[PDB]
Amino acid sequence: NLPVTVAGLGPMGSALAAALLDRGHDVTVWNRSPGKAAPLVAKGARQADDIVDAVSASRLLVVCLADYDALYSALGPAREALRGRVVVNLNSGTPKEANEALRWAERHGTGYLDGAIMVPPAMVGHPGSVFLYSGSAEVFEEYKETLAGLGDPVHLGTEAGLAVLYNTALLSMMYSSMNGFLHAAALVGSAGVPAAEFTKLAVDWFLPAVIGQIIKAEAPTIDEGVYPGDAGSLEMNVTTLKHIIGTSQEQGVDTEIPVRNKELLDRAVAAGFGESSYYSVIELWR
Amino acid sequence: NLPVTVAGLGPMGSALAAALLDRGHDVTVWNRSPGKAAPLVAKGARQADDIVDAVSASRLLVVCLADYDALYSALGPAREALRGRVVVNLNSGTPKEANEALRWAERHGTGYLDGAIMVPPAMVGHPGSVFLYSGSAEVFEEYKETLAGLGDPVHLGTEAGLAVLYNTALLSMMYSSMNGFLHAAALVGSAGVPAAEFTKLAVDWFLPAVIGQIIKAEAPTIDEGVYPGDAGSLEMNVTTLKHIIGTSQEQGVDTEIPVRNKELLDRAVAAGFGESSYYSVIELWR
Ligand SMILES: C[C@H]1NCCc2ccccc21
Ligand SMILES: C[C@H]1NCCc2ccccc21
Ligand SMILES: [Ca+2]
Ligand SMILES: [Ca+2]
Incomplete structure (x- = not known):
C-alpha cells in the first residue's frame, strides 16, 4: 500500500481518489471545503483536514484544484512540508501557469509533473482513459506505474x-x-x-x-x-x-x-x- | 470479356477506363474532343468517334463528363440507341441534377445509377477506393461485380x-x-x-x-x-x-x-x- 494524497475533491478529484483506492493505495484526501470526502472515506480514504497533514502523508501529491484556486495558495501553508515530495498537477489552466507552477515547485525542493486528463471523470481508471504529462522525466519514471491506474500515461516532454x-x-x-x-x-x-x-x-x-x-x-x-x-x-x-x-x-x-x-x-x-x-x-x- | 463504354476522358474518366481495361473488359471510349484516347487505346481500348457508336457498343455506359457539360446534351444524339442500356453517371453536380438525369433516363428506356467517386483518379481500381451509388437497386445488383473493379461499391438507396x-x-x-x-x-x-x-x-x-x-x-x-x-x-x-x-x-x-x-x-x-x-x-x- 503505496501512500498517495489527492488534494481537490471536485468531481474530477474525487474520481482520481476513487480510482487510486480501487488500486489499493493508502489514499489521503483534502479539500478546501468539508463535505466532499465522505464517499471516499467510505471507500478506505483518510480525510486530512489540514493541508500540511495531507501533504505530509505521502510523497506523491495529486493536485486537482478548482479553476479559480491556485496551487501557490492551496499548498502555501505546507511550504516546508513540500520539500522532498512530488506534485502531479492535473488542473493547470494554461501553459504559462504550468511553467509558473514548475518554478514554484523547484523553489520549494518539490518534483513536478503537469498532466492533462483526456476523459471525463467517469472514465478515470477505465480502459480508454489517457492522461498526457509534461515535466520531469524522472518523476514520470518514478510514478508511471501508479499513474497508469488512472489512465494510460503519456509523457510528452x-x-x-x-x-x-x-x-x-x-x-x-x-x-x-x-x-x-x-x-x-x-x-x-x-x-x-x-x-x-x-x-x-x-x-x-x-x-x-x-x-x-x-x-x-x-x-x-x-x-x-x-x-x-x-x-x-x-x-x-x-x-x-x-x-x-x-x-x-x-x-x-x-x-x-x-x-x-x-x-x-x-x-x-x-x-x-x-x-x-x-x-x-x-x-x-x- | 464483358463490354463497357466510358464516355468522358478527363483525368477521372481516363482512370475509370484504365481500371476497366486492367480487369479485362472490352472497353469502348468516347470523348467530346479527340486526343485523349490514345493512352487508353494503347492499353486495349477501342475509340468510338461517334456517341451513337459508343453507346451501341455496350449495355453498361459509364459516364464521367466535364462539369459544364450535360448528359442530355452529350448523349442526346444517341436517344434511340440508349433504350435497353444502362447509364452509371459518375459526375452529377447536385442532387437535383441526379434526379433530373434519372427521369431523363427513364424517358429513354434506360436504367440509371448515380455514383460519387470518393478517391482521386490515381486511386481508382486500388485498395481503398470507395464509390457511393444511388438509384436503381436492380442496376446495382446487375453490375456490382463489374463496378467493384473500380472501387468498393456501396448502394445508399x-x-x-x-x-x-x-x-x-x-x-x-x-x-x-x-x-x-x-x-x-x-x-x-x-x-x-x-x-x-x-x-x-x-x-x-x-x-x-x-x-x-x-x-x-x-x-x-x-x-x-x-x-x-x-x-x-x-x-x-x-x-x-x-x-x-x-x-x-x-x-x-x-x-x-x-x-x-x-x-x-x-x-x-x-x-x-x-x-x-x-x-x-x-x-x-x-
Ligand atoms: C464532449 C464536449 N467537451 C469536450 C470538447 C467537446 C468538443 C465538441 C463537442 C463536445 C465536446
Ligand atoms: C484533398 C482535398 N480535396 C477534397 C476535400 C478536401 C478537404 C480538405 C482538404 C483537402 C481537401
Ligand atoms: Ca505566431
Ligand atoms: Ca431546413
Missing part, C-alpha cells in the same frame, strides 16, 4: 506547459471536427437519413480512412513548409466549397459552416497562397 | 441524389476536420512540435478513439432530438472555447478557428439552446 498545450490543441480540433460532422448530418438529414445511420459511413470509414490517412500522408509536407500546389491547389478548394454552399442552399440547410470555411480560404488566396496546396492555410495561423 | 448528397456532406465534414487539425498543429507548433509528430497522438489515437467514439455514442441522442444538457451543456462549451482562444493568444497563434466555433455556440445560446447538450447546435442548421 520536459517543458511543463506541453500537456495543457496538447489538450488545448486537441479540443480545438474536436470542436471543428464535431461541427463538420453535425453539418454533414444536417445535409444527409435533409433527405431523411438519421445521424446514427450516417455514422456507419462517416465515422467507421471516412473519418479514419480518408481524413486521418490524408493527414498522415500530408504532415511531413506541412513540416517542410513549401506546400506545392501541383496535385491540387488551395484555390481549387474554394470552388468545391462554393459547390457545397450551393447544394446546402438547394437542400434547405444552413450554410454558415461551409461559408466560414470558404472565408478561411479567401484570406489565404488574398495573402498569396492560392496556387499552393490546401494545407498552406496553416501559415496564416502559426 | 433508390433516391437518385443520395450519392451526391453524401459526397457533399462528407466533404463538408472533411474541410472542418482538416481545419481543426491544422489549427491544432499550429498550436503545438508554437512549442516546436512538428505536425508529423503531433499526428501520432492526434490521428492515430484522438481522431478515432475520442472524436469518432463520442460521435457514435451521441448519434442516437441526436436523432431523438431532445438533447438534454445534464451531462454537460452547450453553454459550458462556450467557456472551454474562451479558454482555447486565450491560450491561442498567449501562444501567438491565430484565433479565427476557435472564435468562429464560439460564434456558432453564441447563435445557439441566443436561440434558447444553452442548457441543452452541445449537439443541439445542429437544430439551427437543419
